[PDB]
Amino acid sequence: RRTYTLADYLKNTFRVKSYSLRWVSDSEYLYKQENNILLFNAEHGNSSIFLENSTFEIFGDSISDYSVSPDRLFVLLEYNYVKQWRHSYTASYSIYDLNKRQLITEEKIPNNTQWITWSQEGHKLAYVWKNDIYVKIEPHLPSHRITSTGKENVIFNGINDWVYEEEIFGAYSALWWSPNGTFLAYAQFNDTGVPLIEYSFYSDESLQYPKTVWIPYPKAGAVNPTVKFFIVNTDSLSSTTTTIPMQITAPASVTTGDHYLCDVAWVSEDRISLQWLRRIQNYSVMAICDYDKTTLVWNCPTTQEHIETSATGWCGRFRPAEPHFTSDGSSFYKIVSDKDGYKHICQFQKDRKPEQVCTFITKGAWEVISIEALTSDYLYYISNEYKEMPGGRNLYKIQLTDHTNKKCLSCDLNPERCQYYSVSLSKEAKYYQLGCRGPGLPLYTLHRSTDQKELRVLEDNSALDKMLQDVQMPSKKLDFIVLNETRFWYQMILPPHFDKSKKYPLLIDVYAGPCSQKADAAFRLNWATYLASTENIIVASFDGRGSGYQGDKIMHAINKRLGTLEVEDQIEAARQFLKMGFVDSKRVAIWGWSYGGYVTSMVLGSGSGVFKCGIAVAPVSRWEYYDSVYTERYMGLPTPEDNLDHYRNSTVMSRAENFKQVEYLLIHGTADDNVHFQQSAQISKALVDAGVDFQAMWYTDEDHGIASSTAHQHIYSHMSHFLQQCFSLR
Amino acid sequence: RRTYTLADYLKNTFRVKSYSLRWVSDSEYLYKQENNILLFNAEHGNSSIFLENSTFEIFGDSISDYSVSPDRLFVLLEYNYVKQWRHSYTASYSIYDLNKRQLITEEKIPNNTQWITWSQEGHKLAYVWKNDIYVKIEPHLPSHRITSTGKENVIFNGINDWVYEEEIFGAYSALWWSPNGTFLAYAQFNDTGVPLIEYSFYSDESLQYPKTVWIPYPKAGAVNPTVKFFIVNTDSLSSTTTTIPMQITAPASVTTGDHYLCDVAWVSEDRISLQWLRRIQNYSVMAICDYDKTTLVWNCPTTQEHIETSATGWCGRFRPAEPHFTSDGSSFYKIVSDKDGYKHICQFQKDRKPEQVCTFITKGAWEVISIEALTSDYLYYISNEYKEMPGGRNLYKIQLTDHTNKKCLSCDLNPERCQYYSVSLSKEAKYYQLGCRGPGLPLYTLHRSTDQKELRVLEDNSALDKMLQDVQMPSKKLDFIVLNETRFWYQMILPPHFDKSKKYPLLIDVYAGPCSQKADAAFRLNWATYLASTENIIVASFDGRGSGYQGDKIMHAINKRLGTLEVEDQIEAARQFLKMGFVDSKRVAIWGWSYGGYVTSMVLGSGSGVFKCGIAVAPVSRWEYYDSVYTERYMGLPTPEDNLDHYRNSTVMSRAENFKQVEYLLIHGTADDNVHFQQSAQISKALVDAGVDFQAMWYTDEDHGIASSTAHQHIYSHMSHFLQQCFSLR
Ligand SMILES: Cn1c(=O)c2c(nc(N3CCC[C@@H](N)C3)n2Cc2ccccc2C#N)n(C)c1=O
Question: Which cysteines are disulphide-bonded (chains A, B)?
Fold first, then answer.
């Protein structure tokens, strides 16, 4: 009869387990068990020790992570990890010789590395340090400098600058070892003309004068960083002092004005696939380039250009989808919007074809989330086709030769507990692990590709199950409402003994940004749980216009004009929830983080009178303040020649007046490098000039995540009390 | 039956008048009446128009201020005023020819001047621009550049750098015209090695990238700016292209290590008086320097050195008092602590005397606040001797020849309404205006020095009086309590129909910094009024140890150890107030600004359990973060060789834990150049790491005063609501 305390959430009392493995071959994988790396044989439980409780404790308690070379002859030991942005970070490393049974101590690697990675085959290493690329053909051998143009916050070799790291590649890495590890391709960014943002850092109270941090950051419409792509022949290194990398120049239909490097993908060792994007992501080109043995140069013939375009809005969900090539690299499959606006799979030939470059393998009013594997005869993927639940995730597979032999591999399994699946296939797809994140407690099982015989159960959260028994967990409803004749899904977290006759306070959780999805069938133990289990508050989210994986008609609905429909629909959703009955019209709130904090703010400021209070954490207050890549992708350029007007008609501070009818809570990280603070400072200011009172809270030296332990606990406790005050509880 | 609304306060509904005149001669003065400058004859009401409703409206609504040359032949028109720090600011100027009846338009003065001032006689002007000194012997004539070493945030010629402006001279000016206007003395500051503080400014929401503001600011113990003093002969200018200023080097007993320039004072035209201070204000020297006609050099003979010292703490209230010389400049009177620690007046001879340099003219257990005038036979001053009320201010006068002939000139007048006087005597003291700020509504009267016959009443706030009739104004009690056998004054603002039988909530208003005084007999219409008149809250202040003008024993009580006794005593004061009866022990708060915000914080963090909640606005959180001049004056240097230990044992964040027993409100200006914000950011941080919840509020782009209109209204409304929540009202 115990409720789910805020402490339960904050102190993470009820642990949710998982099985994160690392396929080492087509039939064996690695697993961390009690700080011991084990090798499992998919087929039989056959296990074995790969690395002991030991080895790790030499560098003691600072072993951040490990990386096993693909020949399993060496292991990378990361330690002295230090964050820097979402994915960037610097560590120190040591190579462990599995055979010689000891730590390699000769040609060590720089005690401040920015990035490192094995090749795809041998024990070849490529790392970035002081912004330059270095290579080591063998763990024992000396380093070979590849670039020397590297310079802090100016020239990036093999790693992304701030914006690319966040908005394009999703990671720090800008390296790509070719198969058979001959070449090593990398990108190089010049931030030279990109403006700087400078926020203060305070550090220990012992620091008398506070430091200052600058970052080349391009806000909407400002000068963007430039790019160049190179491929260097790794095999020569031993016979020279310097090697001259060969450069690939982007395709002409892109080199006329600003543009970007979407994605890099090696096809075969003499073929590589690069995707480019215009600054206005209205257009994109994916060139295929071949290596010329004779002239030792890479060619990217317009004949193999391949163009992707969008008259509705922009390309891809957040960028063109990655291509998947066949062994002989003759054809490739890629996810693109079909004639009806539904992201599906279709075949392409290396060469382009006049208005026929595709042939879809998938049709329907649902979308393919991601291609997972390409066999000689099969294509494994993941879609939300099942039960017409766009909020669901299932693993399908199609026989290449017969586009009819399309069978779902996870639909059946456990329909009661699982509707949201994660996958992971062995090197050549002989086995495949399943990640049930589905409605019920996550269930990790492993199967044999051949006939789908579930070999065994890797992890059933039985333990967690046994613990939640003695606790009043709330429920989660996942349905859809319908407006202007269209399904719009939503999800509600209903408190324990939910009684449809009573009235409960409502809280909307928001994101609502382009291609966002808050209404899905995944299991989660978060703040909303405490809010429902113990405060008896209903937490709901609603995926409205401009969103999810329900087709472009819906997603692009927002194109060129954010702060419009996605906001309104968030309001209607509350209207609808009230019409459902069980909601106390006089106690409805709304909060959001990032984009959500925006909408939250934009909603509280609409004067709809539907909401009583809200909370915005590190919200964007006006699109000019946000980074270019993201912003422009939907908003265009903030210029009278383009879309300036819409940038201006969607300012949070312009709706200041209307904030008198609301209790508002604004929160922001003092060291937010993503959503600058300027954003909130600009908001507060506005409200103050309007004579509107509100509540604020800043978090000294916190990221855009306010994720430090102490701060994490602090901010939620605070928001809780804010809701308590607002809802007349506490 | 109307109470005094917060609006009444914020919108300044009940206007308090005053009479600010400008003595032009020993018998006439200037007064602004309905935007018309009038000339009044002290003796008869005889008036006359000096400048019309007109003239001012040419430059329209931007005429910031005016300055009339001493020959009354020209008038300075200041416009395009732009603030910059407490006193610094830049304007544009135009000279008006009273005789020719028009604006001089020939050799205009720089459209961005930093400072300007007439001589003491003619129409000579000296101004600073781009950090250099320029002179114009006549409004119509061309400018004569005096210095060329000037450079932004590096070399200051004729104006003070940040710290000197705030902590030493109290103004931007660093110019001094000699009498008979021959020489022009100025100071020059080199900030070269002074560290920088850089805070961000956000400006209009249209500014995409927020600006950054840097300032050479010396925090405790850091490298201080250096000084040099010069005197240039103004009479030569016309006969050269460049003139070479002569420099005075400070006295040897100061040039061994860091030191300061206390004060500058011209005696006669061939004599000037400079006061120097050691970085450790334990010691100070006041040299008298004479001009050598023959060698064209200034001498500052050790024979006329004059040393001031303090074994108890530091020199002066905030710096050595200014000397007052006789016509023949043979002797001078200056305020210094006597044998008992009471700031009094004593005579000095130009030459020093072995342990006898003084002869006090004033004895007693009270202090002379300030010397106001020195006649051929009289010395007018102002002390808090009357009724033994250290919180009172009265105008006394002593006959030089007879140190017995000491008569008070304002004591009698209106003992019921006035106990706090302001003065202003005509050039040679033939008349004198009185400023009654006393207990009742301010009363401005003018008298004839000769026999003190009150000529007439300049301003009686009759109007304001008539308006407050229809309003329930609160009362103000000014008494003293006694601890360890010593009088310690305090003041309480009692709500309307105050009934000693009931119980009221208590709010302590704080400063409590060295030589501070909150308990005085002055009339004021502030926030505390609304708090009492409408919220029925008692607002009280208590001048405890280390403070006021009650002698050094009390003031120096804090020396070398701030955050000690002044804090404790602030607590005892609340204890005592409770023992008085009429205070609701379960509803006692405390708030403060600046130093007060410190104590407030230090109090809430003492775990005395006496206070329920509090508010700290832009508080200092630890002395290392504050400027050198102020801090070191009481704390010394933050080094193990000196007083580091006490710097560390008085951190607000070190008392974080104890904040769980309190509702706390922290507020801070985003552009605070005085108390950096780092100070609060460091506090918040601390509390967050302690797991303590509190309430915060930042004011985007506000000074250390959060004095913009919109922000001013905003912050008080907010604090009000904070008290309402805390006191269970609203
Ligand atoms: C409550 N309260 C004060 O604390 C206060 C004050 N005047 C001063 N000063 C005298 C002139 C030089 C100036 N640097 C200091 N302080 C002290 C202070 C401490 C720390 C930071 C800023 C400040 C300021 N300004 N007043 C008027 C007042 O009400």
Answer: 289-300, 346-358, 408-411, 418-436, 613-726
CB contact at 8 A, B284 and B262: yes
CATH number at residue B493: 3.40.50.1820
Domain boundary among B461, B478, B493: B461
Question: Within 10 Å of residue B391's Cβ, how many Cβ atoms?
Answer: 24
Choose one of A444, A461, A478: the last residue of a domain. A461
What is the identity of the amino acid at B322? Answer: E
Atom of ligand 1 nearest to the CA of B675: 21
Asked whether residue A132 falls in the same domain as residue A28, the answer is yes
Distance CA(B730)–CA(B723), nearest Å, equals 9
Q: Which among A205, A689, A698 has CB closest to B696? A: A698
Q: Could you tell me if A7 and A91 lie in one domain?
A: no
CB B274, CB B229: distance < 8 Å: yes
**Do B548 and B573 sit in the same domain of this protein?**
yes
CATH, residue A275: 2.140.10.30
The resolution of the experimental structure, rounded to one decimal in Å, is: 3.3
Is A470 an active-site residue?
no
Method by which this entry was solved: X-ray
Strand A406-408, strand A394-399: pairing: antiparallel
Burial label, A471 (beta-carbon count in 10 A; 0-12, 13-18, 19+): middle
Count of domains observed in chain B: 2
A453 & A482 share domain: no
Q: Do B682 and A202 touch (CB under 8 A)?
A: yes
Same-domain check for residues A320 and A362: yes
Rg (CA), chain B: 26
Which residue, A84, A691, A560, A53, is CA-closest to B715? A691
Helix A565-579 vs helix A594-604: crossing angle, to nearest 10: 70
**Pairing assessment for the beta strands A486-494 and A453-460 based on DSSP bridges:** unpaired
Question: Do A61 and A170 reside in the same domain of the chain?
Answer: yes
The distance of Cα A58 from the centroid of its chain, to the nearest Å, equals 34
- Give the separation between CA B355 and CA B647, rounded to whole angstroms: 35
Q: Quick check: CB of B679 below 6 Å from ligand 1? A: no
Q: CA-to-CA distance for A49 and A56, rounded, in angstroms? A: 14
Q: By the 8 A CB rule, do B184 and B232 touch? A: yes
Residue A261 and residue A347 in one domain: yes
| CA B166 / ligand 1 centre spacing (Å) | 10
User: Using CA atoms, how far apart are residues A485 and A295, in angstroms rounded to an integer?
Assistant: 61
Residue with tokens 């324990």: A496
Stated length of chain B? 730
Helix (H, G, I), strand (E, B) or coil at A386: helix
Three-class DSSP labels, B252-316: CCCCCCCEEEEEEEEEECCEEEEEEEECCCCEEEEEEEEEECCCCEEECCHHHCCEEECCCCCCC
B649 touches B655 (CB < 8 A): no
Whether B242 and B192 have beta carbons less than 8 Å apart is answered as no
Exposure on the CB side of residue B621, measured as CA atoms within 13 A? 27
Contacts of A202 (CB under 8 A, 6+ apart): A210, A211, A670, A700, A701, B678, B681, B682, B685
Cα B395 to Cα B345: distance, rounded to the nearest angstrom: 14
Q: Rg of the Cα trace of chain A?
A: 26
Tell whether ligand 1 has an atom less than 6 A from the beta carbon of residue B509: no
User: Are residues B398 and B503 both part of a single domain?
Assistant: no
Q: Are B345 and B358 in contact (CB under 8 A)?
A: no
Query: Which ligand 1 atom is the nearest neighbour of the CA of B510?
Result: 1
Residues from chain B that touch A700, judged by Cβ atoms under 8 A, are 681-682, 684-685, 688
For residue A713, give both structure tokens. Answer: 């606990």
* Structural domain harbouring A500: 1-12+470-730
CA of B723 to the centre of ligand 1 (A): 24
